[PDB]
């Protein structure tokens, strides 16, 4: 909204007036405050939202700004006469008046803001339910059944684990959005934030390795016998988690809970200068957990197209050939679904971080949160893709229901 901005500019210029050498600074600050004040007076504060413009509460609210403006005018009169310190003193009085008579009306979130929290809570809940149940089923199926122990399925186990973990955090994140605070302590704050990064890194790294596995199964059938075993897949899974802990561990450490503006926030506290390391991390995340892995996957499939399209006998049997081909198609589809789901938020974050966009615009904030939600949706979508695209997962699904 405009009100919160106008209110921020009032505060910011009061601080300018406190530490000011000369009357020009004071006059300029006061004049800006007056424009903000007049603008603020035209708003409907969240606490009086959908109340009549001519209601007692609205009249009183507007009246408070007539008083502020009157005081800004007196302070400005003084500043124009050269009387800096008296103007500074007069401005200290605004702060009192403002707090004593206008403060009450500001504070709350708007209905639109609460609407957003409810919609997010709705989506996160649906995602959590389908995602958590779905991936726990996949993991149970892979362990429980002999026929499931395959190199490709061990990789899938790793995706399901990352997705199970990621979706388990959503109810806590939902609660935060509804309550506008973090009531779960620091340890669970550390857990939720680091799990977010683990999901992103372990997932794409695993999809990269599934693409490489497929590349080897198709273009190097003889060497594939050497490389493509369940045990080695498991080994690569572990390596993926170890490697991803290069980002995961720092995040555990930097994740803290702090009291701020009457709430507890769970946040990442980067070392000084915070803005610099925050931005280094974001560009690193974007490159090493999205762009570079996608190049590798693209290359792997590019080289596979030469053999997949321009041949007929890949293996020495009909059953194996079609089995090698559909598993390869599944991996591409799972990869595709991952990129579609994650690309929007990843682009948004870079734009949000680097470009001067209106970060308080209702539409931008709605779109952003939709894009964040789409990233999590990937986790609930994947179990359904395995059921749709793979013979043994369909049979495992049907045996359950």
């Amino acid at each position: 909204a405009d009100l919160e901005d106008n209110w921020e500019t009032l505060n910011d210029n009061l601080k300018v007036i406190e530490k000011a050498d000369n009357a020009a600074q004071v006059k300029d600050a006061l004049t800006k405050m007056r424009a903000a004040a007049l603008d603020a007076q035209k708003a409907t504060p969240p606490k009086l939202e959908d109340k009549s413009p001519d209601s007692p509460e609205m009249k009183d609210f507007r009246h408070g700004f007539d008083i502020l403006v009157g005081q800004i005018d007196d302070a400005l009169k003084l500043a124009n006469e050269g009387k800096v310190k008296e103007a500074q003193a007069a401005a200290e009085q605004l702060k009192t008046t403002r707090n004593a008579y206008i403060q009450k009306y500001l504070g709350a979130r708007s209905a639109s803001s609460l609407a957003l929290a409810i919609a997010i809570t709705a989506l996160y809940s649906a995602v959590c339910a389908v995602g958590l149940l779905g991936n726990v089923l996949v993991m149970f199926g892979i362990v429980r059944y002999t026929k499931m122990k395959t190199a490709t399925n061990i990789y899938i186990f790793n995706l399901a684990l990352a997705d199970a973990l990621a979706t388990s955090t959503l109810p806590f994140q939902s609660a935060k959005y509804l309550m506008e605070t973090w009531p779960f302590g620091e340890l669970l704050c550390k857990a939720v934030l680091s799990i977010d990064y683990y999901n992103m890194f372990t997932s794409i790294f695993t999809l990269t390795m599934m693409s490489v596995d497929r590349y080897i199964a198709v273009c190097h059938p003889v060497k594939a016998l050497d490389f493509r075993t369940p045990a080695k897949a498991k080994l690569i899974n572990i390596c993926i988690w170890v490697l991803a802990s290069g980002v995961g561990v720092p995040i555990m450490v930097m994740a803290v809970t702090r009291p701020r503006d009457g709430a507890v926030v769970c946040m990442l506290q980067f070392p000084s200068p915070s803005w610099y390391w925050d931005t280094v991390t974001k560009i690193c995340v974007f490159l090493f957990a999205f762009v570079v892995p996608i190049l590798i996957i693209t290359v792997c499939y590019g080289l596979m197209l030469l053999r997949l399209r321009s041949v007929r006998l890949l293996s020495g049997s009909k059953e194996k050939d079609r089995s090698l081909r559909r598993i390869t198609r599944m991996v591409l589809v799972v990869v595709g679904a991952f990129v579609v789901c994650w690309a929007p938020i990843h682009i948004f974050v870079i734009v949000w971080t680097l470009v001067d966009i209106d970060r308080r615009d209702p539409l931008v904030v709605a779109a952003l949160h939709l894009c964040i939600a789409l990233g999590y949706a990937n986790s609930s979508l994947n179990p359904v893709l395995y059921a749709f695209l793979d013979e043994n997962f369909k049979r495992c699904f049907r045996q359950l229901c």
Binding site: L193, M200, C266, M267, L268, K282, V285, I345, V349, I372
Partner: peptide
């Protein structure tokens, strides 16, 4: 992803 992402957070403050």
């Amino acid at each position: 992803y992402x957070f403050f």
